[PDB]
């Protein structure tokens, strides 16, 4: 029992950006609210539907909770461009940029500059909602919610950097920055961005990361926060294979200090010496199934002389 | 009852490229075949399994049928890099190139030069098996079969060019070439590649297309061959909507010579004059559902004054 004009009585999914603005103006007068600036929700009705109640309160502290609930009352009676149908973990930097361009058209947002998110989908997924708001004051909340919706519809370090950040040296910090530039497709990260060790890097606030690095500081800080939060029978199961005696034994021989690298025939000869009763072609099949399941690597040599190496 | 050595008695899926070669040499001697050059199948066993019987006969006219059937006798007792999980219709030119690089690693092929297929996935899908062989004498048949397998696991012209090729002028031929360069991501197609009309273009063999255009002639010829081969109740159904009287009428008013572009209120007023009994908010909802279903386009104007245009 709230009377909107005819073109606002349809489903909000249909409301243009002007319809959104006429709705706000209608509500302000209907409910004696504080003035609602015509710029408070620069989007269409489809975009407004993606916003959380918290996003309403954030855009309109005087009236947002009220507008959200007015919207639920009104309600009580997504396919992307071809290259973007992948899980966002796989979007390239170019994809992210095409995602922005699609989104700005789909949702009538204010112009999203093409350097707003210069990073790949993996990096995008590291950012917080706060970081989307910061990069995009007009549309960051819609964009973040857009992404969460795309996720409903559906990172390990280099070896030289797998020790706690607290022990990193200046040099490690430097290798981290250039590892992260490549992994996350970020703008160039000049070698002097963070001239310090891990202990000092751990003292910086996210605002320090942003100042040192306008293009990538938020990604880098959340990467750091991520990094800080993050029996042969089972060995076989864990790699996808049924336990058999021929598998256990061969696996056993490969775990000998001498037999890490071993060819099929030597493995066989080694099995016999131990008094095991296993056939030659069986040794070949096991080690190749082991290869396929990541337990060993086959290194080829002509005529049944490949050497198998336990990974 | 064919006795291979131990490492060739495993499943062919496991055979390296050398194992393939030792198998051929074994077969040649076991079956008194003509000499089989060690270069006849430069691939691993996984690749050999993708080849058709026809590919066997083509690689070995003296012995291929025989090798294929030996292989079926032996048998009688695919996940791509992340960016390539899309239907191949969507692969970019860069994807195609990454597809080649993955394939050459996966299958131990001879080196596939990165300019072997300079075109996008749509273009790749136009090529015949013969064109894959021509572009890649060592691996083209495997690659084509690889693609068919990826498809089991799962183009309209610009308006100025939708008339039969037989009527194309020189100028049209020229617009076709640059439309196709953009659509298929081909190398630059110099304006002098085909200085002639559609009737003459239709006289050229595929070999003429290849000579005029080493980078793209086969794509262009198959594009040409593709092009040459290729009631309101139903109007509503065809666009995804249940027939209702309010829909039929509005659709009817929009098909008037005067009302192609019409706003909701005028449509309403026009319905009344005809003695129709339909409410104003209903006119709004229909035209917006029509918009969403491609029957009209909504052109926005502030305050319920959008003009709707029949597409």
Author numbering:
A (entry chain A), B (entry chain A): 11 to 87, 98 to 174, 183 to 258, 271 to 351
Question: What does the literature reporting this entry say, word for word?
Answer:
Here, we report a novel approach for the design of two dimensional protein lattices that we confirmed by X-ray crystallography to high resolution. The “polymer driven crystallization” method is based on the human TelSAM (Tel: Translocation Ets Leukemia, SAM: Sterile Alpha Motif) domain. The SAM domain of Tel (TelSAM) forms an oligomer with a 65 helical symmetry. However, mutating residue Valine-80 to glutamate (V80E) renders the oligomeric assembly pH dependent.
Here we utilized a tandem repeat of three TelSAM domains instead of two. In order to avoid aggregation by rapid self-assembly of the resulting construct, we selected the N-terminal domain of the ferric uptake regulator (FUR) protein from E. coli. A flexible linker was used to connect the n-FUR domain to TTT, in order to allow the n-FUR domain to sample many orientations and select a favorable position without restricting the orientation of the 2-fold axis. We determined the structure of the TTT-FUR fusion protein to 2.3 Å by X-ray crystallography. One molecule was found in the asymmetric unit, and all four protein domains (3 TelSAM domains, and 1 n-FUR domain) were identified by molecular replacement using Phaser. The loops that link these domains were disordered and not visible in the electron density. The identification of this mutation allowed us to place this molecule first in the sequence in accordance with the design, with the V80E TelSAM first in sequence, followed by two WT TelSAM molecules, and ending with the n-FUR domain. The organization of the 3TelSAM portion of the fusion achieved the expected structure, an oligomer with 180° degree rotation per unit that forms a 21 screw axis, which can also be described as one dimensional crystals or fibers. The 2-D layer is formed by TelSAM fibers that are interdigitated with the n-FUR domain. Importantly, within this 2-D lattice, the n-FUR domain is the sole contributor to the lateral contacts that connect the TelSAM oligomeric fibers.
